[PDB]
Amino acid sequence: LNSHRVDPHTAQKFYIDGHWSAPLSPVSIAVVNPATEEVVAHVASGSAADVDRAVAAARAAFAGWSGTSPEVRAQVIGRIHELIIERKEELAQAISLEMGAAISSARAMQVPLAAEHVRVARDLLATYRFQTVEGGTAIEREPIGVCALITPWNWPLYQITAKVAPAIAAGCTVVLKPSELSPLSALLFAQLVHDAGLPPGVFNLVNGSGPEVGGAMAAHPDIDMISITGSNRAGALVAQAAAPTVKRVTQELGGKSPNILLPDADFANAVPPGVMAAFRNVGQSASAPTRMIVPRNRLAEVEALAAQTAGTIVVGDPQLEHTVLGPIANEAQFHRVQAMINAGICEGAKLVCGGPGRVQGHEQGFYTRPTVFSEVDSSMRIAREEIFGPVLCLIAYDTIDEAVAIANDTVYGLGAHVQGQDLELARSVASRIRAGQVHLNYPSWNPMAPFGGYKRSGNGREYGVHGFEEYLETKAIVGFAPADL
Amino acid sequence: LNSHRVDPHTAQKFYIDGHWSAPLSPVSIAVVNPATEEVVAHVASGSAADVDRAVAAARAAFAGWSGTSPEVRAQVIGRIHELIIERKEELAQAISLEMGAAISSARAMQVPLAAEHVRVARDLLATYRFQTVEGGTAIEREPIGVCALITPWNWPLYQITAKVAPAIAAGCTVVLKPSELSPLSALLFAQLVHDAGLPPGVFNLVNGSGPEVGGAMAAHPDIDMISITGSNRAGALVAQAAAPTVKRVTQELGGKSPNILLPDADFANAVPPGVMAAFRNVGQSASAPTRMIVPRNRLAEVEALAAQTAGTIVVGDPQLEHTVLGPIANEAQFHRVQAMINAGICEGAKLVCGGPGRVQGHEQGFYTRPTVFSEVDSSMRIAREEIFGPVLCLIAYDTIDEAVAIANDTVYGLGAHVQGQDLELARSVASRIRAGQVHLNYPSWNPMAPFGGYKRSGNGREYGVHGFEEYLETKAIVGFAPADL
Numbered sequence A, B: 001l002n003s004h005r006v007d008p009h010t011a012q013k014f015y016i017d018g019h020w021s022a023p024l025s026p027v028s029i030a031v032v033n034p035a036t037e038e039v040v041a042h043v044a045s046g047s048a049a050d051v052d053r054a055v056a057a058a059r060a061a062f063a064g065w066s067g068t069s070p071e072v073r074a075q076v077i078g079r080i081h082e083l084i085i086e087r088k089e090e091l092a093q094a095i096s097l098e099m100g101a102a103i104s105s106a107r108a109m110q111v112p113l114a115a116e117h118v119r120v121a122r123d124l125l126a127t128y129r130f131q132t133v134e135g136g137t138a139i140e141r142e143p144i145g146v147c148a149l150i151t152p153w154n155w156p157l158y159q160i161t162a163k164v165a166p167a168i169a170a171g172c173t174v175v176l177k178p179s180e181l182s183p184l185s186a187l188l189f190a191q192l193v194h195d196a197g198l199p200p201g202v203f204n205l206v207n208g209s210g211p212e213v214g215g216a217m218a219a220h221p222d223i224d225m226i227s228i229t230g231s232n233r234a235g236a237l238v239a240q241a242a243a244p245t246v247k248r249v250t251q252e253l254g255g256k257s258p259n260i261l262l263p264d265a266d267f268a269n270a271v272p273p274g275v276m277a278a279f280r281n282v283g284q285s286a287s288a289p290t291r292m293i294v295p296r297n298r299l300a301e302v303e304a305l306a307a308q309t310a311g312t313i314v315v316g317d318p319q320l321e322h323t324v325l326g327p328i329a330n331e332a333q334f335h336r337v338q339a340m341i342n343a344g345i346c347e348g349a350k351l352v353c354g355g356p357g358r359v360q361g362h363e364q365g366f367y368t369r370p371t372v373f374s375e376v377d378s379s380m381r382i383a384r385e386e387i388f389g390p391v392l393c394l395i396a397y398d399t400i401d402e403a404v405a406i407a408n409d410t411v412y413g414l415g416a417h418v419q420g421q422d423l424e425l426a427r428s429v430a431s432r433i434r435a436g437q438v439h440l441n442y443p444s445w446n447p448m449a450p451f452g453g454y455k456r457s458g459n460g461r462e463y464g465v466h467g468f469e470e471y472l473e474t475k476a477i478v479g480f481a482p483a484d485l
């Protein structure tokens, strides 16, 4: 049923300097459909020499593009956005195919939320003041230059858009390494910016492994900035690789986001949305609220409510419109999550529902059972470590002060959730969570809100004007207007 | 004549948690007067265990201080500023003693410019909006937490102030490692914040080597951010040491700042100020304009003008009010500069004036001759490498387009200078220099202008509101106001 077909002519090519060119190496990367475990396509595996050709194209194109007026850059970006909306069905099918997102999920969110980043960067150029005059001193905001972008597989198009749209809008030039576990939609996206009219060399695509291609980028002497969305392990290696060239380093990494239900919350109506939030994209989301923090005298009620809403999630074939969750995105991730579930069992957590093993009736495919643990201690492995699968922890508290301490009891700080009837109280608690975003009573997504981590969830912000400013340098021209006397 | 006396009771102590405490190790660091080459004092050498006590104090004090109202924090900072102004003569004598700054220079700039950073952070709290409401989403700016500050010896008090004032104002808590080659003025500064009323643990001082104390800070699991002003070599090592904890990393590093004289400039009145600018603080300044870029058909005139103004700089005893330049700050730096001068001779540059050797008549003390090279090629070592002594390069150009290419022909981008009669033209050139600051026709210093590097001159900005925001996280509270329907 899945309708995506990889272009045979460009599958094992790179997009460099306005054209698809042969890779310098013959190594291939097979792409596996997580729903069937079959290789559905191959893509090329870049070398450092390929990353060289791409950086050279980006460098050569930077003067022309940064010299293009904001209004005109905004026109190209606008057109890119139209093309995403036009080819959205094609894009939803490739995302689903490569990382198993329920086709329903791919149409409703995987693509449209990505479109939104592009829209926001377009509208943004209409008002942004690149120069400001404070007296005799003028502040000019300029593109930082050639940028390395590395993205993960869980929200593949969306994570490419959060980086490319602002980078391009700022006047930067960009070389992107997509996840080798979700390369197909990136292939469509490169074709899309080509068709949208982006000058050769402004956007460049190279496929390959993190350590080889990503490593080359992090160390390249001609790259002015690198932005990575991925694991902490990879984030730190790129930071270390980038230090001697003193690049600007932007990192969006792991999380263990808390969901505090305050005592005055409507538990029957708030536990189900939290569970659904924790298990969105089958838990494959860094900001997912996977630690639900609730009053002890209410734990047995929320346990029942969590098993109840978990048990009604339809897990199955992503090709069906009524499937809610597809499989874990790939074999490596499947086995990691499975290990985390078994670790929780072995450390004595209560298995409210779910458990290990493939989902019954989908033995082929990385289908993982939606899992809920309760009576969870903050010291447990499943409470401290990001699992990146559908595994929700229930944690009890005896005071609101205690609930905040548990929420902050983590090396991470990417996001957080608060449920409460008294809005004043809920706000004061939110301002006490050390996290880049706190969400009150399940607000809807906001494409202008800065997104990023405190502590070990990263460095920098994406989305909206904040994300746009990550790609600008800052210049002071003192004596811009001569002084008096 | 120098009147500073180190407090014998606190010289080999650390300022931790509101008191002077014994170091955990008995290692001492001798402090040498560069003007006489005599050890004038000793200070303690911290261990990782000392950095632990200091981080613990900072952590423990962070809740109280961040919970103190901006208005009240601004009052403490205001008082710190009064005390700097009151004890300025004592502070100028300690700076001069430890790193050889001409006493005249220490009174006029070394201290007052440092006072200014403190003033700017005080006034700033009066207007800064820590919360903003964009609809149903609120942006709250919060202190990032415990901060490691590492500073150099060339502008010792001033570099401590650019970091501590904004950090404290933001609500952060701070542990500072001063340069072990300029520890005496830091000792007075710690006493000063104590007397000013800063709560125990908000500011902590530990002395010691970069690799040992600085290394401990860069790697500490409880430090949320580290800011370093120093060499590229040290900047990258701290970045690498900090990567696995994902700290915020702020770096102010080397420079090779160009000074372009455009053809319409008044060469007789512009060459002398450039030379004086290059040799301020005897060249011991990262942003100093040490590459003077001038029209070829004008080189012989600027050469003569540079020798002329160089030859009239009074180099001698910093204890004399009429001394203009003191010695290089310390023996290590003296020998480094001397090697750079000899390298320039050996690579065929023209020695317009200056040369190697101690300044005649000051054989005792690290007195270095003000040196000017001309007919300098961009590929020369003396053109590519920061020298950090009084060594000015003269470079010729045949077009304004060429002059810009030479100015940007550098791994650095900390600052830059433009001389020109047509202000429109001079502005357009300034916007073409890839540098954090460009200064037109020798404007006066601006404590609100963002200061920092493009490319390899660092990451982040100091001074004014920009520097203040380096110590704030960014939080989005989505659903702050419930939505319609």
Ligand SMILES: NC(=O)c1ccc[n+]([C@@H]2O[C@H](COP(=O)([O-])OP(=O)(O)OC[C@H]3O[C@@H](n4cnc5c(N)ncnc54)[C@H](O)[C@@H]3O)[C@@H](O)[C@H]2O)c1
Pocket: A150, A151, A152, A153, A154, A155, A159, A177, A178, A179, A180, A208, A209, A210, A211, A212, A213, A214, A215, A218, A228, A229, A230, A231, A232, A233, A234, A235, A237, A238, A251, A252, A253, A254, A255, A285, A286, A287, A386, A388, A414, A451, A452, A457, A458
């Ligand atoms: N904060 C955010 O906005 C955000 C958003 C989505 C996902 N994430 C996080 O991403 C993770 C999921 O992705 P993953 O674990 O598969 O990512 P990962 O860290 O394993 O890989 C991410 C990217 O880095 C590349 N890479 C791997 N090793 C590299 C190396 N040493 N040098 C350079 N590049 C290298 C990979 O090829 C990939 O493109 C989760 O932790 C999730 O929370 C964060």
Ligand SMILES: NC(=O)c1ccc[n+]([C@@H]2O[C@H](COP(=O)([O-])OP(=O)(O)OC[C@H]3O[C@@H](n4cnc5c(N)ncnc54)[C@H](O)[C@@H]3O)[C@@H](O)[C@H]2O)c1
Pocket: B150, B151, B152, B153, B154, B155, B159, B177, B178, B179, B180, B208, B209, B210, B211, B212, B213, B214, B215, B218, B228, B229, B230, B231, B232, B233, B234, B235, B237, B238, B251, B252, B253, B254, B255, B285, B286, B287, B386, B388, B414, B451, B452, B457, B458
């Ligand atoms: N950009 C700016 O605002 C600015 C301002 C002033 C000076 N500087 C630069 O500073 C340099 C002058 O200072 P320097 O060369 O003596 O500095 P340096 O790099 O040798 O030392 C700077 C600081 O780092 C510490 N340190 C040394 N090694 C360390 C390590 N491995 N880990 C942690 N800390 C370590 C030192 O003890 C000192 O406190 C020049 O390059 C100058 O341009 C920059």
Ligand SMILES: CCCCCCCC=O
Pocket: A113, A155, A284, A285, A286, A287, A288, A445
């Ligand atoms: C409504 C959720 C939007 C998707 C957020 C994905 C970012 C986290 O990995």
Ligand SMILES: CCCCCCCC=O
Pocket: B113, B155, B284, B285, B286, B287, B288, B445
């Ligand atoms: C007027 C010069 C102010 C001092 C600038 C010092 C910063 C560079 O090291």
